[PDB]
Amino acid sequence: SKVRVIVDKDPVATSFEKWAQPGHFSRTLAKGPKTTTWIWNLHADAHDFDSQTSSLEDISRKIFSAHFGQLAIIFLWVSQAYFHGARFSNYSAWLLNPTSIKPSAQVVWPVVGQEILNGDVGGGFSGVQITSGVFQMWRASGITNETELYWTAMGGLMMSALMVFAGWFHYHKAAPKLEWFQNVESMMNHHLAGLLGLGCLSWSGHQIHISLPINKLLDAGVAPQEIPLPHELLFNQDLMAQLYPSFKKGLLPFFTLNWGEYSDFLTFKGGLNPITGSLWLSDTAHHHLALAVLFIFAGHMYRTNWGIGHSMKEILEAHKGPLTGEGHKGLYEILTTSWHAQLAINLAMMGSLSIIVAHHMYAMPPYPYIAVDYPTQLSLFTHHMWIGGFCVCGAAAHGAIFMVRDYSPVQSYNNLLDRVLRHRDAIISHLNWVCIFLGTHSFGLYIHNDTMRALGRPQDMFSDKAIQLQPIFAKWVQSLHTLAPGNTAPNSLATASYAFGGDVVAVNGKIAMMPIQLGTADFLVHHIHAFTIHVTVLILLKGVLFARSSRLIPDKANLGFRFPCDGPGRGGTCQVSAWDHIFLGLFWMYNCISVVIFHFSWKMQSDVWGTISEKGKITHITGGNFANSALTINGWLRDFLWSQASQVIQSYGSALSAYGIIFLGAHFIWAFSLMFLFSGRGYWQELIESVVWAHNKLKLAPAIQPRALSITQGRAVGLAHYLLGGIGTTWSFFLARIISV
């Protein structure tokens, strides 16, 4: 038995002693503050466990306990949504009419005149409108009662207390040894089967036994208070057979492999449910079954205590070719002896997954009546875009940290990491050329369109009435997807999503999903997206590759991961660290995500969202102006920003006035960022000296000497303020626009 549980007993005593000794974790900060830099260094080095201890075992134990604390915070955050739905919401009135009642689960206290924020959301309720989509998520689970929300909140509180106790227990009572964490094959098998496949299996079971009958009865017109309770549906084959006439046969067709008898509640019809404008829940349960079987099957791959299985060291070391030398040899030790490498991979995967979630949940609305809730769709898309962008920047940050700290040349000789590091100039040069080519083309077409329209030459533009740039490949892929049911998806009733072409889906006048037509403006903005992604990749990859050394500075690894410069020498070595590369790439991530969400908002308001009247008359929100106005920068400025800021600037005196307040405040914070971003430390230090003179004159000098913020801290403060102001301005603008139309 090689895979075993080895655990130390009572390693660290639980005491409130180092709570009163701040900065105890590091050697330098524990000696007490002399200046007002020890405070910021205390805050910056709190989670840098690799610089506190040289033992990987203690670092891993700290990571595990911190994971438990994070999971406790997330459980409390789930419990807040369930409790606010139970006690502070209009979820019942929304259930009785989920097309005219606006969801709201957040009520303000009247003290200062802020009771105007309690708007008329419908159903005899006053509160702030909710764009989280938790109401549709609860309706997709069959939570028609307000008691089940309360008990879900109580269970979430219990689970959060459990995670707090587990975090204390695994650091102070039973902390696992280093050999426990390095069982990556066992961890991989257990995650792939028990977490993913068993979660899919249990959720498919809940779906089949609770959400399918309750949502079927809800779509049939039965009021929520006359629907059988989920425990009355769980153990009633007669009632389920009344709803789905396949439970008469019971579990026997499952074991006899006659799975075709279960096609009443396990379908592959595709498309959207016409009643709710969402995916069929039978398709969802079938999807979760397929995923559960696939994940449990995949969790049987890696070797554990028994002789069957794979070793991941042998898989990696067998993959090598002529052009790559030793191949993947030595990556197993890298990924089993370093946490920063695992962050660099997992953050990239999680950011890309969040972006995939954003692209998939708008064209395929998975919750009932979420497609006709336009604020929910816009908020979810923009949210997951921003989360994905932040995580994909953090992946490059931790790759740089690994390259500075945990890299070893003796371990990684002539493998893929060494070969990548030995030709980094070619990579950075060619990616530089690609960035310049994409930028010149994609942006100069916009500038050329601006010039032609300003010179009174619309016939010389890059438009559909002019020189055309038709995205022929995307149109071909759309035509392939539209013809998939029957030909390349023979057991399919409808298309995967209606964005690829097909039929307009309408739920009580509003458009749920209709085909999205691609023109030359779509070609132009997709090339803009590719260019912005490429420049962000250029900055982050240059930071990762040149983290150890460069032609300018041969010993950059000896200076650390983050450091301000190496003096004014060599003409100037400002922002040479990989940290400054992450700092510069975060701005370009912000630019890319802002352009992506602007494209989404304008295209969906212009060509998808709207109303339908008699004889299929489609009237969109903005009037189909994306095709001719998204070709010029002036068209963007006038028809998107100026035209859609009318809702956020006229929100004063109404229930949306908080959005205007946050609009102004986020503009203020964004402008406040440039103070740190443009200026430098020495001026502020001299001004602080001038203030310290007056303080010394009035016997007011603090013993902790006041200092200006450090150069790295000044850059970090400016970047954080810039991101907060930008995301706040876009947040308030989107929410105030899309709530009011």
Partner: protein
């Protein structure tokens, strides 16, 4: 009166703003059933609006052509309910805060670990100075006359110039 302004109790635009403010909430009130806490909250808002406008009329504020109260920071005695009396109140409170901070600074300087007394506050002594700073205009004057408030000037560090 001053600057051509009229009293808010004698201004028609102020009363028009009153009527508009109560009519907006009355129009918001019509979609709620009576006895519900939303209805009670809205009528409480209406009563609060009426009380606020009546108070602004009664306090003697001057409204302009827009029907909004205009504060006279001149220093006239009949407008001392404006700036001057909150000026005295804030000056007293700000001097209180400054003197409490200065007294705790002196105490923390006179100890053995001045740095640790500023990130970790000696709460009993801090409360002592904090409550004893209520007579700051007298204590500060006594320290100024005694020569303990100000450093001579040749003892504070200065840049070379």
């Amino acid at each position: 009166d001053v600057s051509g302004l009229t009293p808010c109790k004698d201004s028609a635009v102020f009363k028009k703003r009153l009527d508009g403010s109560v009519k907006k909430l009355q129009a918001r009130l019509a979609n709620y059933t009576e006895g519900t806490p939303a209805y009670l909250a809205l009528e409480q808002q209406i009563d609060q609006t009426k009380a606020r406008f009546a108070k602004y009329g009664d306090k003697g504020l001057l409204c302009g052509a827009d029907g909004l109260p205009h504060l006279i920071a001149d220093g006239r005695p009949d407008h001392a309910g404006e700036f001057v009396i909150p000026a005295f109140g804030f000056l007293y409170i700000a001097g209180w805060i400054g003197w409490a901070g200065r007294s705790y600074l002196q105490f923390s300087k006179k100890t053995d670990k001045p740095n640790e007394n500023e990130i970790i506050i000696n709460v009993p002594v801090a409360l002592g100075m904090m409550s004893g700073a209520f007579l700051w205009p007298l204590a500060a004057w006594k320290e100024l006359i005694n020569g303990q408030l100000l450093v001579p000037g040749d003892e504070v560090t200065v840049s070379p110039r």
